[PDB]
Symmetry: T
Subunit: 165 residues, 12 copies
């Protein structure tokens, strides 16, 4: 005979170890990137000429974390999500169709939402990596969390609000 | 001459670009209102690009055996663009609206340049207009976006 | 796919999928040649992002609305992604890259054809430049694999 | 013999030190549309202000003087008044505050220009003139953002 | 009010705009041995003319004035005369036109200098001083190519 | 100094005064070594400026309100300023910088301690980076003075 | 694509010979204006070399086999070479570069036409870009020589 | 108090000096397909190694310690063993040798991390961490070229 | 090859042919290693071009008349060219380069010796620097081919 | 009409050439603790002296003058005195010597400033002013190294 | 044939390795006025020494030799002696030690020159020549700091 | 036993200084078609001459010598003779003057080369060789401009 082929529902979704949460990051950072690109492209209104370019800067920073976090996952022996289907299903951020009729304030507020989520994800990754004693991974999350939180201050300040982290 | 018209539209461009530069200088200088700090330096970027086209088009014309307009009287009399005196009381959005309008004219100019030069088989001149049109159109998108509008080319 | 705006948006989806695949090759790569090709994938991706931005933004300039969600990229792209696997050779990785680049070169030909018919010379040149470059890469990638470009 | 020149140099040291402090408060406490342009702009202004403070302090040293060099001295000799940071100053208000400070500095620099000319200190004179040039350009730009004429 | 400082700044705007046009004509129409050096040199002169033009107009704005800003205003106010482009002018003759334009500029800047000195406009006075220094150096140089003394 | 915010604001006050002392040192310096040590103060000042901005901004980020007036810096800082004097020797100037730095090293360790205990990991690493560089500067200044770092 | 491929290879022959002529002009130049024109041949040579590589590599990408020996170059090229001679005037050497450029400009027009007929838009832009630049140079050289470009 | 941290820092000075010797050996004796990529890559590794060895040695000095600083000290104290150069070794063996050196450093740097953590030396702790992060990435890449998992 | 002048001109001829051959290797290359060795042929050609210019120009300085036509290069060179072929393996290409370089080193040695005996120190230095560089390359290429330099 | 401006420019050309010569002696014959920083510093001072000499020489040409241009002219018209190099001179003495030279030049630039101001040559006046500022700053610095006030 | 050229090149590998290690000890153990200038200067020396070390071994490889490549080999073959690091050495003593090292290396490089001169290995000969020129420059400078003649 | 190498090094210091002065005169006094190119070209030559002067003097110092270091010493030991600057001299005459100085220098570097070969001073030999190579290349270029062969 032969070993039976197991048929069960996709197991994961529980952020229990460093590996798990690094992959969740790969997923969320890929979608974040896509949301950022849509804001870049669909943006209209006073303040476009400053924020259009800014989205590029954010995107590059997000790219940087995406790469180092999946590559840390690889180094630790894991297997990073690497298809749009994987990214789209494992991510907790929702995507919507691009729309040109959104005010600047609403765009910036959407980016703050995404940044708040990512900062909590990196907080979770920090805590998990600390508990498991994976100090390298721990530092990666902390660094990413530092600058995301700083971007949240600035965005909120443009919106006339405190960071409210 | 086989290339008489390429020549004529290149020189039209020389005149209109010189006028366009002038207007962008006026916007840069007379600008007042929230957004000054971003748009004032942006006019410099536009001017540098307009300048780059003015030089390239005039010199393509020289290369083809033409005599480019090279006096303010010539630019002025030949250009289809109309200049008005500077006024500090124009709003930032009216200033950007004017820039979009100058740029729309230039896109149509470069379109005609493109067609005429494609007609006469001057493929170098064709490319020059094609590159200029491409850039100007991108600029129109951005300006319109800032104005809360679609590019509407 | 019979106007410039549809071909451009199709390119948005396909370049987005091509970028994802190039990333997968970057990460899962193993074997002799890794030290040269792993970094090369970043060059390829920087380029693909280059075109993605220019095309999407040409569409916008032309009054279109780019695919801008993963669902849209995935469903609209003609490219097929598979799960990442470490157990693929460098030569196999390269061959996959060439397949994708071949697909892109052909998409760029259609964009070239369609915009030429429509008299949209700006879009036409964007497709033209992207093609010249994709084609150069296939020559080089095929050469590493000991084969002619076979365009 | 260069006593009036020395006094105005040192007065500028106090004032520039306070001005720098105010720019730093505006930079941190800024909130509202245009933050993203004006926040970094505050660094540009601070660098320049630091540039003058150092240059003028060292011109004073070079003349045989002794520049104020403590926060107490800066705060007590300066004519500018500082206030507790407040996040609810609007952008426009923040810009108007920088304008008030720059106008003060332009007038201080005028006085320094005049006094150094009177004492025949031509090097000190050109130092104030350069500073004045650039400050007035900044007032022109600030006021333009505010939709106003430079009003020098 | 600095009425004449403003008047000379605006005269400079007009004349530099015409000077710039004249240098462009020389760049384009130039033919003869020396072309390869002087053709590009015309770009360097234009960039410098451009610099003054923007600095002077911007100093005018800063002072409360309203710079000339249309080609008609440039032509009607400039003292410089423009002629149609001709390819049959020699290099030596082109260089002679430039010297003549620059001798004019240097005289204009002397007036700008004298007027701003007199009105106590030291910033403007420096702007003119810097422009005149540069222009006069160029004159020495062009004259030297032409085998002649600067004859300032 | 009740928490992370409190210590951040203390660093804001102390870094401001520390920067002022450094400028005093830069300006009133005389003696053999001037030519190396005078410009070196500029390097120290840029670094202190950097910590000052980063720490105040971390405080902003966290919902605090940084000291931002000279009175506030002066009031809250634990460093004491004295009038400039040209007759201080170069090695005496370097010793005052060492004292100021040892003070800032201590401050930053309290900062590190407090943030660690509160779980403010970003603030923690900020004080740690600051601590590392100051302690290296102490080693180098003490070395110049013929002494061990004596942390 | 036989005709596109043939004109590309022709250009390889002729650009290799043009390059050698420029190198001769560079070395054998004597007369007033040497100091401006001697380095200018280095810029011309650099640019010629860029076309040469670009055009044979295009040919490779198309599945051709570019001429690649001095024999192939001399035999296929329509340019004729003469022994070096220091007795040539500066103006004479410039006229010889003008002649050679006028020739390449014509060849590039053939290449452009042929490629346009065969639908090879990529080769077509390559010829178009080379021709834009050679013609600018001819204007400039002719102007140094007191003449209209006469294209 | 900080004796254990000082001890591991000094161990690292020793092992890093030998490591760097081994990389230089690889660099010079390398032969085979891939020489052209890997030979200069050893240079990257050496300079990164030199970087850690200076940082760590200077952190030891800063703590009041006395770094090993003679070839005899390095050899005696290093746990890494050196062998004679041999051109006959294969590229893949050369790379396997670099991996085994790095796996050792990574383990050493983890010991440093742990020791310094227990002692409260947070600066020393962060130096090992950054070192460890870097080396582990290198092991992944080196293993990748050899067709293997990182096995960390 | 009687004297310094004569060997300088000989090198102009051989360096021209060597550059030709390197370019052939750059273009016709196929197989694993292409991605590192294709661009490596650019660094080599660049270097060869440096020597060729320096050597001919030293000869002009010396009052000679450097070869300046492809006919002179081809007829005077001891190096021999073959038709381009895609079927040559990477290692064969690499070994071709080695053999050209070995010839060049031997030529430069003769150039060194000849200018030495004529007391032309400048020409001597030129051949020395050229030699040291080529031998370094020979070690490196041989290393790739799994062999000792065997000078 | 411009004779005194031309005179003091040409006197500066001579003194600047001798001063360059002196600084090069100091550079070469220097020995003593402090060499490693003061040796390269003399290069910086020489480049600056060179800049003034070229600028002032060329202002003189521009004005229709004829700069001193031989070592014999420089040596004979200079108020500065040269002696044979000697390795025994201490570092303080070397530095005190450069100060004396700088003091002379600063004074010479003051005469130049005065004279051009009288003759209304504002461009020449600015050149002397700029030169004077920088030299006085270096005097402060060298005096400070020497443990002293600038005592301008 | 080239056995003696190879042998001295290999002597150089071992000595430059030990020279580098002594420079590193000097860099780490330095204490005294001058530290902030001389500490970085040891880095520059170390860089230059590595430069020679890599080039000489690679020249050896190129010639068919096998360079020393283990700390054991460097130690055994070097004629330089190493002692434990001591903080209580003065800056002047530390510099005198470098001067001793360099004096040795320049004697070595002269032997390398003469040997290769004899064996007609003109490339190896230029390498030693370049190295010697540079080391002798540094000996002049270090000695000048020490108030001494170069005394080659 | 080193002494003639030192004497040629010192003659070079004198002649290079004089040559630097002559090039400066040509820079300033040049008039005529070609000015715009040859005027800046003199700068390049002067920077190069200063390069040699400094390297040669410092090699002399390194050898335990005492370089000429006053204008009088340069003037009286130089074989080159200076004349009063004159504007009327043609461009072609000026270049010929530089050619004549460069031929003197190449010949002097040849004597330098030979004397240092005989004395076994390889470092100095190499300095003269390098200088000679570049001077000869300039003669070619200058001669080419004047429509002549180099005639070395
Ligand atoms: Ca709405
Ligand atoms: Ca008036
Ligand atoms: Ca005391
Ligand atoms: Ca004459
Ligand atoms: Cl502006
Ligand atoms: Cl990577
Ligand atoms: Cl973009
Ligand atoms: Cl910030
Ligand atoms: Cl041009
Ligand atoms: Cl300073
Ligand atoms: Cl050359
Ligand atoms: Cl290529
Ligand atoms: Cl250090
Ligand atoms: Cl003449
Ligand atoms: Tb990566
Ligand atoms: Tb142009
Ligand atoms: Tb974009
Ligand atoms: Tb300062
Ligand atoms: Tb402006
Ligand atoms: Tb900040
Ligand atoms: Tb290529
Ligand atoms: Tb260090
Ligand atoms: Tb050349
Ligand atoms: Tb000059
Ligand atoms: Tb190496
Ligand atoms: Tb020197």
């Amino acid at each position: 005979q032969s070993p039976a082929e197991i048929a069960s529902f996709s197991p994961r979704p529980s952020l229990a170890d460093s590996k798990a949460v690094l992959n969740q990051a790969v997923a969320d950072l890929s979608v974040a990137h896509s949301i950022l690109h849509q804001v870049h492209w669909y943006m209209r209104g006073r303040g476009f000429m400053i924020w259009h370019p800014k989205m590029d800067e954010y995107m590059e920073e997000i790219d940087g974390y995406l790469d180092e976090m999946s590559e840390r996952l690889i180094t630790l022996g894991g297997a990073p999500f690497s298809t749009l289907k994987e990214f789209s299903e494992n991510s907790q951020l929702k995507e919507v169709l691009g729309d040109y009729n959104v005010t600047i304030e609403e765009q910036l507020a959407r980016v703050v939402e995404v940044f708040r989520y990512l900062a909590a994800l990196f907080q979770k990754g920090f805590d998990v990596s600390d508990e498991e004693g994976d100090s390298v991974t721990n530092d990666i999350f902390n660094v990413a969390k530092a600058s995301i939180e700083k971007h949240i201050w600035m965005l909120q300040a443009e919106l006339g609000q405190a960071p409210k982290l």
